[PDB]
Amino acid sequence: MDTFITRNFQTTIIQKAKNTMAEFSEDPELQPAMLFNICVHLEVCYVISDMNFLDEEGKAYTALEGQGKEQNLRPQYEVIEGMPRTIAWMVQRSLAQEHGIETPKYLADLFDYKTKRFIEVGITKGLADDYFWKKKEKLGNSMELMIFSYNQDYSLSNESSLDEEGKGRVLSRLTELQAELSLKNLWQVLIGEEDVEKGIDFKLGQTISRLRDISVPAGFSNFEGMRSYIDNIDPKGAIERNLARMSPLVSVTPKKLTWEDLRPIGPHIYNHELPEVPYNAFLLMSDELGLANMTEGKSKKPKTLAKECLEKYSTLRDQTDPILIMKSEKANENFLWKLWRDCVNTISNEEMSNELQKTNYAKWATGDGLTYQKIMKEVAIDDETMCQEEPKIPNKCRVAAWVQTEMNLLSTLTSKRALDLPEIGPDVAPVEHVGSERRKYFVNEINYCKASTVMMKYVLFHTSLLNESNASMGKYKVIPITNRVVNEKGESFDMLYGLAVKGQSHLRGDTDVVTVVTFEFSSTDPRVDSGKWPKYTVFRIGSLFVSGREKSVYLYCRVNGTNKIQMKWGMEARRCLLQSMQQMEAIVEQESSIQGYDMTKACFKGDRVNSPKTFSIGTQEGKLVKGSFGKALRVIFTKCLMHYVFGNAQLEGFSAESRRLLLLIQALKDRKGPWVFDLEGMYSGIEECISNNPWVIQSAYWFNEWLGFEKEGSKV
């Protein structure tokens, strides 16, 4: 309330009200409503006494402001309210003696020279008549009365004491105060000159009081006891008294951390007894075979594009006798081959519809019908064989070899570029010119790396999957894994990488799973490394010539499942690009901080004064190898892409917990002498995440190798 008083009242009136409250020993802070009432009383008294003067004849009249008439300018009303009690009493007595009038037994508010009377001014929230009668009874007829209410009504002992303007102005001020209070919700809280002596009432019932009584710390028996104890008892070293007795077997166990303490994380990956990690990513990355058709540039529906792409390659389109290279463990060769044949027929059909024409064979090919039937709780309670499935923990695998090869291959330039970005407005400021130069130098590098093509393929596939799911809910659909690739000459090839059957996506929630089966063209015979493909049932659907060198063409078939969350994140996987640029930007900026000019050409290609910037990128035979700035940018972009594709709970738990060791190593390299409390705890936390994620296992392997390198290089 005090804020409202400060805002709506002048400091002078507030000071007068505070002085009056002090004279009565009443605290303004503890009774803000009373302070507001006193301030309003003073303000209305001053407002009444203003502007009113008496002419030489003694007739009431108005006098202008800022325009004095010698000295006297006798005002009509002399304010008595607001003076110190002694001074107010003396002034009242002096006026009574001077004008020969009886001295009121009660101190007055104003005095009118014209009527030669003492006037009392009152305010109320109730009816003016009631307050007027109460005040008259308390004080009597010795003093004229003027009471105003907040509802635009008033009671005046004499109707000629105040003109229309004065009453209108006081009522306007009161109404404005009321409206402002209501806007601030203080109106209901506000309590008048008869209830302001009570205060807020909020008393606890019986059940809540009992709950408070039993919810007191140990050693107490009632909340009154706790309240008295807290208000009275003074601790003057209780902390030290408790510490002086607490057992010395509790402590942070502070141990200094040296290089030797750090050991490789997740030694079980090295062990060969465990199985090689399989390829669990949604789509093939370094094995995709692009059925490429040159196109003028027209963008067409994916179904028509796939139709045309197969039309160009009649041998693969019309292949109908498969050669099973391997049926993995559970999937049925007949189901997968018939489903793929239906896919090809639907794609190549004359009708634009891209929905499976069988609708019944796919139901068992995708395993939708192989689901349990839910019963009510009662039967489950009664039946004895309805147990609870044991949790299925992930397998503990070893370091594979395909992950490293894919990491290498996706991070190399290719003549084909797909990543294209929309234009932006002309750059007129120097800063945006520098930004444009840096952006061009970056895209000239990233665009031609195969990881960019894989990322665009993933984004396009997930966008198409989301569109199909939203449009089609309870019907099986056919979805080409399409991409668009522009070569250096500007030819806009359209690439078909395979097909996918989408199941029934009629799902209200987001976490609900929808099954999709992917058939992918590839040029890799899995028999070369069968450990990479234990989840895939494949055929050998023919061969093709790229330039005269015949190479086989297989179809990798696999059933999988996704959800709306991963489905959306597929189209948000483009942010990897941003993560690739930000850091490099920072790098370049750091260089610019050293020497004044801009180095984006120097770091990338070098200049006559500075050599090209080279990072440490790889290794061979125990010999670390450098790498150009562009290659390092490619490595970072591929790292981000893998952080996405192989991302799950294990990856998060691994990264967010190995960051501890990363920062500890960073501190050690700066000779900060970091100390640790429980190292084995951190190591266990980290290594309880290396179970079956290929990227997690390879990250652990690379971390161990890099830690070994840092250990060997720490000698200097």
Binding site: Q10, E65, E165, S182, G596
Partner: protein
Amino acid sequence: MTLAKIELLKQLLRDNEAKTVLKQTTVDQYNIIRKFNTSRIEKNPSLRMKWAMCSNFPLALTKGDMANRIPLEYKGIQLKTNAEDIGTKGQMCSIAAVTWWNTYGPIGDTEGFERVYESFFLRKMRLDNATWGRITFGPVERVRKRVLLNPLTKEMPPDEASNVIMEILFPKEAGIPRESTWIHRELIKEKREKLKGTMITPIVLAYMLERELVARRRFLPVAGATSAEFIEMLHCLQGENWRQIYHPGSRSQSMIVACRKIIRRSIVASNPLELAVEIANKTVIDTEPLKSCLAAIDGGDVACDIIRAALGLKIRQRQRFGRLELKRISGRGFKNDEEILIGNGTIQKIGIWDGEEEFHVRCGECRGILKKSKMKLEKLLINSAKKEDMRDLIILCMVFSQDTRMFQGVRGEINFLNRAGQLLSPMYQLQRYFLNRSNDLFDQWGYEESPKASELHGINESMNASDYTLKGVVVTRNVIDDFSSTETEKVSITKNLSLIKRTGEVIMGANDVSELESQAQLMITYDTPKMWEMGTTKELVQNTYQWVLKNLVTLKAQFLLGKEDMFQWDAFEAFESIIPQKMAGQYSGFARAVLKQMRDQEVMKTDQFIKLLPFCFSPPKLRSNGEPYQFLKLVLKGGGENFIEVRKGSPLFSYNPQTEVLTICGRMMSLKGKIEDEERNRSMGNAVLAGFLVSGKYDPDLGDFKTIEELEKLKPGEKANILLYQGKPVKVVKRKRYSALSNDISQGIKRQRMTVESMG
């Protein structure tokens, strides 16, 4: 639609729930009622929008006649559907119709965008005409500061902003204009005229006005300029390791000077607070009282903070000592009186702070951290900002710390005063002594080895970045960011203008203000005779003419009566001080005769009336025969350019009737014309429902209510039945005058204190 409104109301009331809720919840409670929505907010807006854009008709069109302009299917493309809706009760549509509307359809009005979206186009103008420069790739030092993100036409607090918006674009529901529309009358009328002639939905205009008025401030890392114009482009200008040169396409100094003058005027008298607030709320800067820029900026000079405390405003609770802004970090200092010998040999009894303490310290552009113990400074960390600011910070922190070395370093004498001629406490006397003679405690303070470290480097007594620094002082090559939690905690004001905390501790003292004079870059026009008997003759003439101009209605009305009471005004007494004594009486007689002739044998002429009125304060001295002396060139004190021309105009006064403009002391003011017509044009701002006061209840004797336009038809003193705010029928009376509550309160206080003194 009003019939549709009443039919909908009747249908809604037919249900008992509507009847009971409507008759139960007052108008104020409506807010609560509105907030009881489903709150079934979409969990993922991206997925929802993606799905909706692929649906046949995601757009929710409002029912109306617009749809008939477009077929339900154009060129074989489905656009809109006639199926009913439950969520919005309208129709459905697709982005195809939106694109067609952008292609064809009704053509609207382009005028509204010229002024309605003024802020955006001003942003574009500031961008287009900006001039760019070089790029500095070197590291940039940035400080975290509270900066205004966007420029504001006139910064005001949120409540005043809302009230102004309502008074602008909501002519109805304008009960009892507060003491805020008169301050912003020019803004009210300007925005009202600009937005008239539009058809945009009112809520859009209200939100845009809120953006254009209500301030938006944030903590940002900045280096260099800090005005909102540069902050708009901070994303491009600044940079962690790069900087750009940018130049985007005043009142502050004047307010500083005015606040300092008010402080000096009020301090010398007894009960300074009331006099200071009277002058502050009676002052004006060219269009508005001082509560139009004081309330705009956050904090400011100590004088402005003290005045704001005297007025009603929020001030940052930083402790001002001289120029230092101090923010306590920890520790409690016990202020105990002690007798200490000063280096001059004298012994002074002053308050010393027992116990350790630490304060963030700021002075101009210098920031730092100070840690002090009783009778000793312990540590001081600073950043290199400016030699003058660094020296001021060092010296002021030295004096504040009350280090025994500082006392032992005194060599002269401490008997100084202020411009008002008062003896200050020994602390401020020492402050002035040391600032006047900076090389007094610096020599005998003692030196300390340089802060050997990676970045910490010392500074010598000459403020150069030289090693062998002062004992304790340290300069770190980093950024010190301080002054968090600007709570603006409750602060009291004593009569002597000195602020205090919620407790009895004193934060700002009356003598913190620095006694430095400047020149008001604007017309500082007061309204009280007491104030302006300090400055030059030109200032006196300008202020007297402004006083005459402001209350032109009253003087013009008194002119018709033809009585000498009009001339015996206190406002002209100060003018008497700048008229030669040997000749002022002749001027008074001549002007009185000329004005009597004007009243008798010709018609209104405001310019000459204003020019000739003020000189008549002194008594006349007629010719020996009795006729008045005749003049055409009224000389003023100072000679030369200080002279008034009776005929047409002079350097101090020239009115041109071709454009009807007034130039006083080299300042053009718009006298639209003459006549109560120009008076009412001046009143063209004000506020709807400003000429009517409230008196009585509904009083159905008048029948139905009447609009503002029909309200104006009523003659003064009538009774009318109107609706206040959202309903609330009341009875009002047309006003016969213009009111000023601050003036009434000030005069009441003056009478009260006159009575107190007379009895005393």
